[PDB]
Amino acid sequence: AEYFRDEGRDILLFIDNIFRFVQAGSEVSSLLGRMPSQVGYQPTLGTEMGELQERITSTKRGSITSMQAVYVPADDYTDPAPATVFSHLDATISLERSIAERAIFPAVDPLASTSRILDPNIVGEEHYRVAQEVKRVLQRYKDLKDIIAILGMEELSDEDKLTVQRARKIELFFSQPFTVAQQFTGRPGKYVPVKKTVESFARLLNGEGDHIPESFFYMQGDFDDVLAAYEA
Amino acid sequence: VAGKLKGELAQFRDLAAFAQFASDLDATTKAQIERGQRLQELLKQPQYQPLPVEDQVAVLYAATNNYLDDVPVPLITKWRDDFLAFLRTAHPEVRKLIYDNRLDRKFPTPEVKEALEAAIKEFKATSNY
Amino acid sequence: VAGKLKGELAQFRDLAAFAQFASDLDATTKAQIERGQRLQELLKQPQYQPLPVEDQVAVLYAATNNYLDDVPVPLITKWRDDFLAFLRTAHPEVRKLIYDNRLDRKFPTPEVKEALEAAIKEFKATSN
Amino acid sequence: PIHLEIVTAERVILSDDVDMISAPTKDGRVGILPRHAPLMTILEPGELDIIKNGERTPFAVSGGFMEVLPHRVTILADTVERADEIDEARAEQARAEAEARRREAQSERDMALAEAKLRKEMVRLRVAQL
Amino acid sequence: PSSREIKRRIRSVKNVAQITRAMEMVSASKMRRAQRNVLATRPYADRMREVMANLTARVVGAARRGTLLEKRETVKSVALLVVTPDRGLCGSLVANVLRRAGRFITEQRAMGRTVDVYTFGRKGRDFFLRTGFAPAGEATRLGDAPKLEAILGVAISAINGFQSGKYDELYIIYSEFINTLVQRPAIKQLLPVESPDISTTTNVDYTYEPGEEEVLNSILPRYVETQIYQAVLESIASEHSARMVAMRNATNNAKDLVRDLTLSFNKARQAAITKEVSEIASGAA
């Protein structure tokens, strides 16, 4: 990838289960006879993860972005392997099957996925505001899981029925038809720029989108796309 | 056939905490728990007794559809055993038909569907539970 | 004397869980708990005061034969100390005969039972 | 054409329209009508009939009160057991009150909650080594 | 700290959380059926209340205001009705109602008046037995959806004691169903003061074919009995709501304890593996 980066291009480097890189390093260190370290991992765990993952940077000429799958040993986010990986992570996406039974193509859990760059200074004020608002309404909907399931929709108070109603439309609107998904589903591909996403979700929250019933934000791009297409 | 089985077993596992409270619940939840218990009893199998593919398909077609609801839970295994014996001796052609078109894109074809439905109805009429 | 003690105390270790924070148990479990507490209270000993074998046998015979139900729990220790004092002062001959036939196959000899239940009754009359 | 409302502590019996009432008042049976004069009276264990276009149903009120005004008639029958209930005993009603009720409405509930409390209490101190 | 006992603790607390979730959903079902029963019973009292309003408006003579209409002077003895859950795990509801009953008794004793309490439900009976003041009349093992006949056993006793002069005033304390989150106790009287449902908004003179005395003697016991029924049924709804909330909180606490114990178990496992590998490495050297 570094050749294409040196050519001034922008490169995506996908690594599958970097934990396998960590444990391969651990096995190599054990074979060389080095003293084990804190789980049995290689003593040079930090340095090995630094030699890799430090060439994944945005230089002046070009940039290498990366998206690295990670396997957590047991489920310990405190384990040295995922810990050292997290020391070198700028974002985290928690894909979930729960968003897959309800057929949304990006099966991303918005309440668990995080990113360092999501702050006002870098992504601007409006992007951060809309992201926080979406997270807030989704968190309210997660909390009201018990109210809706134990008791039912009738117990929901005013302005909290609306929150769940908008949460449904937000969860569906996250779905997008991919240009590579036209074989699985047949819908044409769509690339929504970040600013379009910000404007669409801001409009959905402070206004339009309530009179339009849900299940019509399914597989749409900008808010204009859903509006024009599914308001006819 | 097995998509419904997987869904129902998942539902039961979600509500598995109510086995000792199954009766004292909603009608729909009671139905789900009853179906899950019947399926789990159905998946019990003795040793050195493999079931051929057509036999498993027929059994799960019966179980997924509302056929074993009348059957009491503790007798599901005996139901399966004697129903299989019935198919082997009474309706070999149904087993042959299921096996022949197992690879079909739309397995529940009208001919196999009606043959299997007739066989299971006949067995339920002949037997008592 | 200790077989019944051990058997009775075994059940307390099991069904003390309900004793802890439930006051809606059956009568049998209440009886078992209340009897277990008496026994585990008897095992409470301060330091540097060994009890000779005859004293242990006497107190444990008393507590095992239900003679020690009326006494409230916080006062069992003072009751037992007073029992030792009464045996030492009033009737050392019951101690002597308990220690004399502590090796007998059938320990509850009729002669042993008398002058032991008589002595505990005399103590009970004298104190409370 | 008066708003009859037979009510009870456990539930409401009926609130439909009526042409005539046969109220078994204590000192003597009294009839109520669309625009009846004001009355408010005790009832006794007896027999109350209502006419629905010429159809009589023997409600058989076992006692209570009634308030009559020229807009509605209210029957506050403390204990009313409709003698016009063949379903009773035969299907649901009292039969339900026997098996669908007072067998699983409280008894099954009682022992189910009891059992849940049992396993709770046992597990509370099966974990008491923390 | 052994990485195995912590596993047992996690399993036990997880079982606790699951059984508590079961408790929560069953209690929610009971709360909804109880609220439905409250709504169904509401019309009867809703009608009897304006009947009381009108009757109180008509009857003004103190001499003819006998039975439950005697605002007797020189109060000596007062009776109180306390309604409690049959079983525990209700949260702080029982604590609230019992504290209210206790302060009521202390205040009445401050006025020099003897008090007597009738307990609905086992918890109130047991509390008052342990305090040392035996209740005169108790009605335990009450059903989830009780009939008015169940409350008669205490209501008729209270009113008989009232008429005979044994008790001069009657009160009831019950867990008021303010909301599904809050269930505070509420004191009410059972000596009809002016039936303030709708005051005397309706003004229609009635004929009392039994007679004024007979009418009042028959109706006032019925009115207090339906008031007691309403209080008991409201208390049942409050009980089920409070148990549902308490079990929801208990499940959340159990899940938090599961997270804490999982963290401790993970730390124990990492330490155990470190000790393992360090010992074998030292043995190698």
Distance CA E82, CA E170 (A): 11
Distance CA A30, CA A42 (A): 7
- Encoded amino acid at E231, one letter: A
Chain-centroid distance, C-alpha C56: 8
Non-local CB neighbours of A66 within 8 Å, separated by 6+ positions: A12, A13, A14, A15, A53, A56
CA distances from A119 to A56, A114, A129, A183 (A): 22, 11, 9, 36
- Give me C82's structure tokens: 């007073």
Distance CA D95, CA A85 (A): 68
What 3-state class would DSSP assign to A225? helix
Q: What angle do CA E219, E81, D117 make, to 5 degrees?
A: 125
Per the entry, the structure determination technique was cryo-EM
Distance CA A8, CA A63 (A): 8
Beta strands per DSSP E along chain A: 10-15, 63-68, 91-92, 114-115
Residue A40 near residue A25, CB atoms below 8 Å? no
Non-local CB neighbours of D98 within 8 Å, separated by 6+ positions: none
CA distances from A30 to A73, E179, E283 (A): 19, 64, 15
The helix-helix angle for B76-90 and B27-43 (nearest 10°) equals: 60
CA-based radius of gyration for chain A: 22
Dihedral sign of CA atoms D124, D129, E1, E7 in order = negative
Per the DSSP assignment, residues forming a β-bridge with E181 are none
- Give me E144's structure tokens: 């989830």
What 3-state class would DSSP assign to A92? strand
Distance CA D66, CA D74 (A): 6
Beta strands per DSSP E along A36-131: 63-68, 91-92, 114-115
Closest chain A CA to residue E281: A35
Non-local CB neighbours of C112 within 8 Å, separated by 6+ positions: C97, C98, C101
Residue A108 near residue A118, CB atoms below 8 Å? no
Q: Tokens 């060439």: give the residue.
A: A55
Tell me how far apart the terminal alpha carbons of chain A are, to the nearest angstrom.
Answer: 47
Residue D68 near residue D36, CB atoms below 8 Å? yes
The helix-helix angle for B27-43 and B2-14 (nearest 10°) equals: 120
Q: Tokens 């607390």: give the residue.
A: E13
Residue E191 near residue E52, CB atoms below 8 Å? no
- Give me E102's structure tokens: 């206790």
Q: Does C26 touch chain D (CB under 8 A)?
A: no
Q: Does C125 touch chain D (CB under 8 A)?
A: no
CB contacts under 8 A, D 3-32 vs E, are 5, 7-12, 25-28, 30
Distance from CA of D121 to the nearest CA of C (A): 6
Resolution to 1 decimal place, in Å:
3.2
In SS3 terms, E216-260 reads as: HHHHHHHHHHHHHHHHHHHHHHHHHHHHHHHHHHHHHHHHHHHHH
Task: Select from A36, A75, A78 the Cβ nearest to the Cβ of E277.
Answer: A36
- Give me E233's structure tokens: 């049924």
CA distances from A188 to A175, A177, A183, A191, A220 (A): 13, 6, 10, 10, 10
B vs D, Cβ pairs < 8 A, gives 10
Q: How many CB atoms lie within 10 A of CB D96?
A: 16
Tell me how far apart the terminal alpha carbons of chain B are, to the nearest angstrom.
Answer: 25
Residue C76 near residue C42, CB atoms below 8 Å? yes
Non-local CB neighbours of A119 within 8 Å, separated by 6+ positions: A128
Residue E64 near residue E213, CB atoms below 8 Å? yes
What 3-state class would DSSP assign to B8? helix
Q: How many CB atoms lie within 10 A of CB E15?
A: 18
Residue B76 near residue B38, CB atoms below 8 Å? yes
Distance CA E92, CA E140 (A): 20
Q: Which helix (H) or strand (E) holds A133?
A: helix A120-143
Distance CA E54, CA D16 (A): 25
Output phi, psi for A31, to 5 deg.
-65, -40
Distance CA A225, CA C84 (A): 96
Q: Tokens 């709770």: give the residue.
A: D120
Chain-centroid distance, C-alpha B16: 20
Non-local CB neighbours of E41 within 8 Å, separated by 6+ positions: D9, D10, D11, E229, E230, E233
Length of chain C (residues): 128
Residue D75 near residue D4, CB atoms below 8 Å? yes
- Give me A133's structure tokens: 């608002």
Distance CA C35, CA E228 (A): 43
Distance from CA of D86 to the nearest CA of E (A): 23
- Give me D48's structure tokens: 């109350």
Output phi, psi for B64, to 5 deg.
-60, -45
Distance from CA of C26 to the nearest CA of D (A): 12
Distance CA E121, CA E143 (A): 10
Residue C83 near residue C62, CB atoms below 8 Å? yes
What 3-state class would DSSP assign to A73? coil
Smallest CA-to-CA distance from D63 within D15, D26, D14 is with D26
Distance CA E66, CA E217 (A): 8
Chain-centroid distance, C-alpha E261: 36
Q: Does D112 touch chain B (CB under 8 A)?
A: yes
Alpha helices in A87-119 (DSSP H): 98-101
Q: How many CB atoms lie within 10 A of CB A207?
A: 9
Distance CA B81, CA B8 (A): 22
Output phi, psi for C49, to 5 deg.
-150, 70
In SS3 terms, chain D reads as: CEEEEEECCCCEEECCEECEEEECECCCCEEECCCCCCEEEEECCCCCEEECCCCEEECCECCEEEEEECCEEEECCCCECCCCCCHHHHCCCHHHHHCCCCCCCCHHHHHHHHHHHHHHHHHHHHCCCC
Residues of E in contact with B21 (CB under 8 A): 22, 26
Q: Tokens 């997660």: give the residue.
A: A142
- Give me A48's structure tokens: 């090995």
Q: Tokens 């802890």: give the residue.
A: C20
Residue E192 near residue E69, CB atoms below 8 Å? yes
User: In sequence order, what DSSP letters do the residues of chain E get, joined into one string?
Assistant: --SSHHHHHHHHHHHHHHHHHHHHHHHHHHHHHHHHHHHHHHHHHHHHHHHHHHHHHH---TTT--GGG---SS--EEEEEEE--SSS---SHHHHHHHHHHHHHHHHHHTT-EEEEEEESHHHHHHHHHHT---S-EE-S--SS--HHHHHHHHHHHHHHHHTTS-SEEEEEEE--S-SS---EEEEESS-SS-TTSTT--------SS-HHHHHHHHHHHHHHHHHHHHHHHHHHHHHHHHHHHHHHHHHHHHHHHHHHHHHHHHHHHHHHHHHHHHHHHHH-
What 3-state class would DSSP assign to A13? strand
Dihedral sign of CA atoms E94, E97, E98, E99 in order = positive
Q: What angle do CA C34, C38, C44 make, to 5 degrees?
A: 140
**E26:D113 CB<8 A:** yes
Parallel/antiparallel/unpaired status of strands E114-120 and D30-32: unpaired
Distance CA A33, CA E285 (A): 11
CA distances from A143 to D119, E114, E251 (A): 28, 50, 14
Dihedral sign of CA atoms A72, A73, A79, A84 in order = negative
A vs E, Cβ pairs < 8 A, gives 37
Question: Could you give the count of Cα atoms lying within 13 Å of B83 in the half-sphere of its Cβ?
Answer: 32
Distance CA B92, CA B73 (A): 27
Chain-centroid distance, C-alpha B61: 6
CA distances from A216 to A225, B122, E95 (A): 11, 47, 51
- Cα torsion B61, B65, B68, B74 to 10°: value is 70
Distance CA C125, CA C114 (A): 16
- Give me A50's structure tokens: 């630094």
Chain-centroid distance, C-alpha D87: 15
Output phi, psi for A121, to 5 deg.
-65, -45
Smallest CA-to-CA distance from A137 within A101, A173, A102, A107 is with A173
Chain-centroid distance, C-alpha B50: 16
Q: What angle do CA C30, C31, C32 make, to 5 degrees?
A: 90
User: Chains touching chain A at 3 or more Cβ pairs under 8 angstroms?
Assistant: E
Residues of B in contact with E21 (CB under 8 A): 17
What 3-state class would DSSP assign to C113? helix
DSSP classification of residue A93? -
Alpha helices in chain B (DSSP H): 2-14, 27-43, 53-64, 76-90, 92-100, 110-126
Per the DSSP assignment, residues forming a β-bridge with D22 are D31, D49
Residue D97 near residue E3, CB atoms below 8 Å? no
> How buried is E226 (Cβ within 10 angstroms: 0-12 exposed, 13-18 middle, 19+ buried)?
buried
Distance CA A25, CA A36 (A): 12
The helix-helix angle for B76-90 and B53-64 (nearest 10°) equals: 130
Closest chain B CA to residue D108: B24
Distance CA C22, CA C8 (A): 21
Residues of E in contact with D105 (CB under 8 A): 143-145
User: In sequence order, what DSSP letters do the residues of C54-99 get, joined into one string?
Assistant: HHHHHHHHHHHTTTTSSS-GGGHHHHHHHHHHHHHHT-HHHHHHHH
DSSP classification of residue A27? H
Distance CA D94, CA D101 (A): 9
Torsion-angle region of D28 (φ positive above 0: left; ψ -120 to 50: alpha; else: beta): left
Distance CA A111, CA A108 (A): 9
DSSP classification of residue A179? T
Interchain touch C–A (≥3 Cβ pairs closer than 8 Å): no
Non-local CB neighbours of E283 within 8 Å, separated by 6+ positions: none
Residue E176 near residue E183, CB atoms below 8 Å? yes
- Give me E241's structure tokens: 């709501």
- Which residues of E make CB contacts under 8 Å with D? 5, 8-9, 12-13, 15-16, 19-20, 22-23, 26, 30, 40-41, 43-44, 47-48, 51, 54, 87-89, 143-145, 147-148, 204-210, 214-215, 218-219, 222, 226, 229
> How buried is C3 (Cβ within 10 angstroms: 0-12 exposed, 13-18 middle, 19+ buried)?
exposed
DSSP classification of residue A157? P
Q: How many CB atoms lie within 10 A of CB E102?
A: 13
